[PDB]
Design a binder for this molecule. Sequence first.
Ligand SMILES: CCCCCCCCCCCCCC(=O)O[C@H](CCCCCCCCCCC)CC(=O)O[C@@H]1[C@@H](NC(=O)C[C@@H](CCCCCCCCCCC)OC(=O)CCCCCCCCCCC)[C@H](OC[C@H]2O[C@H](OP(=O)(O)O)[C@H](NC(=O)C[C@H](O)CCCCCCCCCCC)[C@@H](OC(=O)C[C@H](O)CCCCCCCCCCC)[C@@H]2O)O[C@H](CO[C@]2(C(=O)O)C[C@@H](O[C@]3(C(=O)O)C[C@@H](O)[C@@H](O)[C@@H]([C@H](O)CO)O3)[C@@H](O[C@H]3O[C@H]([C@@H](O)CO)[C@@H](OP(=O)(O)O)[C@H](O[C@H]4O[C@H]([C@@H](O)CO[C@H]5O[C@H]([C@@H](O)CO)[C@@H](O)[C@H](O)[C@@H]5O)[C@@H](OP(=O)(O)O)[C@H](O)[C@@H]4O)[C@@H]3O)[C@@H]([C@H](O)CO)O2)[C@H]1OP(=O)(O)O
Ligand SMILES: CCCCCCCCCCC1=C(C)C(=O)C(OC)=C(OC)C1=O
Ligand SMILES: CCCCCCCCCCC1=C(C)C(=O)C(OC)=C(OC)C1=O
Lengths: 239, 238, 239, 243
Amino acid sequence: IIIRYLVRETLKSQLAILFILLLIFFCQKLVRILGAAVDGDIPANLVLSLLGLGVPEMAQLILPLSLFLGLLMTLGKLYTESEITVMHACGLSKAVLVKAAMILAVFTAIVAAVNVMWAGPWSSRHQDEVLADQMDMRTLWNTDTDRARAELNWRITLVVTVFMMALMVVPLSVVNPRQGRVLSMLPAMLLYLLFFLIQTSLKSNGGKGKLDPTLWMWTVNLIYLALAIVLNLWDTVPV
Amino acid sequence: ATLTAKNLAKAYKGRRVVEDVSLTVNSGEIVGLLGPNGAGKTTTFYMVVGIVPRDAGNIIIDDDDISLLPLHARARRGIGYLPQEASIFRRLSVYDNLMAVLQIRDDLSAEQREDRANELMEEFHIEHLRDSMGQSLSGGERRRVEIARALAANPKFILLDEPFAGVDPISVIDIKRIIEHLRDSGLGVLITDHNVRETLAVCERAYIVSQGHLIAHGTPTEILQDEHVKRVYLGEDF
Amino acid sequence: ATLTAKNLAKAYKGRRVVEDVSLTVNSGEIVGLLGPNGAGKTTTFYMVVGIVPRDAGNIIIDDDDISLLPLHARARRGIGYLPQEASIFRRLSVYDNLMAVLQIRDDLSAEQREDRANELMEEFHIEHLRDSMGQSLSGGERRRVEIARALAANPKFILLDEPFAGVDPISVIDIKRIIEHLRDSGLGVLITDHNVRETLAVCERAYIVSQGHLIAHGTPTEILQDEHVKRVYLGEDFR
Amino acid sequence: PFGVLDRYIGKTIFTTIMMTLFMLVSLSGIIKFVDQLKKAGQGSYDALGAGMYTLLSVPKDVQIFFPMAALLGALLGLGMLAQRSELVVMQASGFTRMQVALSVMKTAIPLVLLTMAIGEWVAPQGEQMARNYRAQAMSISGLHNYVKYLKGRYQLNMWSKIFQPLSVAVMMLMALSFIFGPLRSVPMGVRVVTGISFGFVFYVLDQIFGPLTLVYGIPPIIGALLPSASFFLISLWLLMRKS
Ligand SMILES: CCCCCCCCCCCCCC(=O)O[C@H](CCCCCCCCCCC)CC(=O)O[C@@H]1[C@@H](NC(=O)C[C@@H](CCCCCCCCCCC)OC(=O)CCCCCCCCCCC)[C@H](OC[C@H]2O[C@H](OP(=O)(O)O)[C@H](NC(=O)C[C@H](O)CCCCCCCCCCC)[C@@H](OC(=O)C[C@H](O)CCCCCCCCCCC)[C@@H]2O)O[C@H](CO[C@]2(C(=O)O)C[C@@H](O[C@]3(C(=O)O)C[C@@H](O)[C@@H](O)[C@@H]([C@H](O)CO)O3)[C@@H](O[C@H]3O[C@H]([C@@H](O)CO)[C@@H](OP(=O)(O)O)[C@H](O[C@H]4O[C@H]([C@@H](O)CO[C@H]5O[C@H]([C@@H](O)CO)[C@@H](O)[C@H](O)[C@@H]5O)[C@@H](OP(=O)(O)O)[C@H](O)[C@@H]4O)[C@@H]3O)[C@@H]([C@H](O)CO)O2)[C@H]1OP(=O)(O)O
Ligand SMILES: CCCCCCCCCCC1=C(C)C(=O)C(OC)=C(OC)C1=O
Ligand SMILES: CCCCCCCCCCC1=C(C)C(=O)C(OC)=C(OC)C1=O
């Protein structure tokens, strides 16, 4: 029951950020498309429909982010109303806070995988079909085993980050009444920013070839995953 | 049982807020922990519950050390907490949030959940609210549910936190009635608040702590007779 | 002078929280405004001050209607408001708080403010602290500088909001000795706190409201022996 | 005229504007820095855009971050005075509401005289060598007479820079109407979220509905004045509503 209360409450705040963070990304995708239309190609055409083919590419960021931002807004809302302090003052653990952040993360993972397998390729095949080897964006998920800069990893590191950002929020959305409610997100929001600045500057900096998922792209995914466990299992002896 | 709290201490940035307080409570006995707002009363109460981790101290619930445990593990072995502000589950029915705690106690069968939940709605007069959600009740109706589900965890020594908190004097004649009800079921209540004209009427013995150490204890007719409390707190009370 | 109020009315959405409340405070006279919570006793108080705009009322000081006026123009007719919070200017020294509002009055010449300020710091026995800021004064100087600052704007009907409001019963003698001193300078005062044990022990009249309107307006010995107020309010034992 | 309340209500707003703008340009420095070393490797390690994009591109970023950090500090600094209950007690002593308005606007005179100071001498001179120090390893005076070397898209760029200080003074006017408008002792979290919402709407309304007016048909001088005047009318309507 208390899991079905937590999943039903974050989902109404996750399906609301998905239509709020959409306007931020739609407008930002519309700023850069006007620079290539007031001086680029003639805009008697695609400018509405080309924007509609950018949504499964911008869904690679707003789908892990809406779960990350959704668990901050709800658990921040339930601590300050003293509903989680009274949750485990009458007998339950922090596991029910973790077993509610993963039964929800399974929902967003199978939308992130269906977005990154044969939905991103479907639009990028059609995006160049309206403007009428080394592609790595049209290329479907099976034949990413060929050669040098196959970026199968940035197509697989954003399905893992749906699960792993769901584990960093339940120990970091504790709110101290000294710091207030809006200041207890800057530990968590800056930590999300430090993840996608490294994940992007190891894909494009490592695509042309200096450092690849051999000793650099999956060690930052694992120092940042083991951080999500030692921060979550602080209730023991120190090591 | 015989919850005992010996030698509690704490340091906040070098400052000493509490040193060597010794308060006990037996079953079927309301003890009070009050004092002036110098840290004292507040931080000592948040160690018996367990939201504040101790510096050095020993809490035992009548046989066993629980002092190194969190709040949530202490709720399995007894102790049940009531927050000060409104802590009913806001979007859930009254029967649901009375059941969402009752689904966790694992020494019951699935047909014993429905009798025990029905035994609590009849006891606290909430049978006429079994479908209504939260955030739609009054300060005398929400407070009934907040106890009716913290009693559903099978506790010993419910310890309430400021359960007067600003309320008119006609609605303290029933807050005192459900508190004297819990004494008549074998649960030693530990009350702590600001409203000192009422807890000295309901308690059997109080623990006035002030400026660190515990300064006096005993029956409330010995409290007003004492002169040493009278310089820091309760100037010319009655 | 006198401050009288005539037939207050206030309705937010449908329900009328205030329905025809009238009071009269004279000079040199404490009078409480009491009642249960949500019965309008915090709404008919703020209508006298002017935070919430009245609807059908008539607030009158001795020979001027002020019912249309906002708070900033009502504070020059001789009305002083003291909120139930800290309300000390934090990053401004305790001399400057009694100087920042002495410069508001225009009938005081430039030299005539400093001897008035040193008079106020001497009268409330706070002369010894002059350079302390206000972020760190006391619990007992967060209540004496507020009065010595709201007295500096030359009030006539200083309106307290919850003076006791959770202090020690040893500090209810020191925040009561300066309320009776506040009326000794010819200054009516309207307490409206919640803790009904000491507002009846300091005042001379009361105005207990219940859900829209007055119930009794006598001295405290005409209220504890009343029968109608002992059912929606205090109870059956108050000896 | 410059009392004690005048030098205190206009000082907290000056620091919280000046120390928000530092916290927004440093965040726009770091995520511009790691953008400019995924290009390095052409004879330039801290020289392409990594190292010397700190004095050469930061005065450009205190011009596109300056209006939405002027709505902000006049909301996060003035909202601080309303949270700890010092703005209702200024009115309860005689300091009126049009004197609060008169004292936040006196703060804006160092602000708008600084922005057109470094919007003419420092920002284009920095940004001009911000490309030369990159391309080697791979104003109002200077932009007025170039309107006749065409014989559109550039006259909008000049005319949206003269009353760009007017975009700063309108933001503190809108941030003042929110404090005397939907205030309700609303917590500090919402004043952060209504400071980003109308802050982001300004950035969209400046760069979308600037050129979109020009493409259809308009004089360019009113398309530059649209993102400030449409935020002057919202502040004016919000002021004359609760009375
Ligand atoms: C709810 C709360 C939270 C909300 C969060 C919301 C988040 C929204 C995010 C939206 C964006 C998401 C993006 C994404 O998705 O996520 C990415 C990942 C990270 C995501 C993180 C997300 C989560 C965050 C979470 C936070 C916590 C919650 C990032 C991205 O996107 O990263 C990158 C992006 N990032 C950003 O902008 C930062 C991003 C980061 C994200 C946002 C972070 C926000 C955080 C907010 C919260 C903070 C909380 C604490 O923020 C922005 O945007 C800001 C947007 C507004 C934000 C508002 C935020 C607040 C909102 C609040 C709302 C309520 C970057 O931009 C760079 C700068 O651009 C302008 O600079 P300038 O203006 O110019 O100065 C900006 N100006 C501006 O923005 C203006 C703005 O007004 C300024 C700011 C305004 C602020 C407004 C504020 C409002 C405030 C309101 C109040 C607060 C700068 O601004 C900046 O810095 C911005 C500044 O910091 C500010 C930032 C924001 C600050 C915010 C503060 C907030 C404060 C409050 C809150 C605290 C900006 O940095 O571009 C990169 C791609 O570019 C490249 C590349 O590098 O690969 C090169 C491009 O070409 C150019 C160039 O354009 O420069 C020119 C070329 O000529 C060349 O020179 C080249 C290089 O030099 C070469 O060496 O460079 C182009 O090339 C291709 O096309 C060209 C042409 O056709 C079209 O152009 C061709 O030209 P040509 O052919 O010649 O025509 C090219 O040809 C060359 O190359 C060919 C090939 O080689 C190419 O290669 C292929 O072929 C090879 C083979 O051939 C051989 O092998 C292969 O080998 C290769 O592998 C490959 O296959 C050759 O072919 P051959 O012939 O040789 O074969 C050819 O010959 C020739 O050589 C080529 O083909 C391109 C293309 O994309 C794909 O093809 O690719 C992107 O990488 P990407 O990721 O990879 O794409
Ligand atoms: C986290 C930083 C951005 C916060 C943006 C506002 C979030 C609150 C508004 C969205 C929301 C809407 C519109 C909403 O309608 C809604 O309805 C039931 C919510 O429920 C939980 C919402 O969260
Ligand atoms: C229009 C382009 C900018 C959009 C900015 C986001 C607007 C939606 C999110 C903010 C928001 C929140 C958080 C919110 O809580 C809220 O509550 C009632 C809103 O009401 C209208 C909001 O707008």
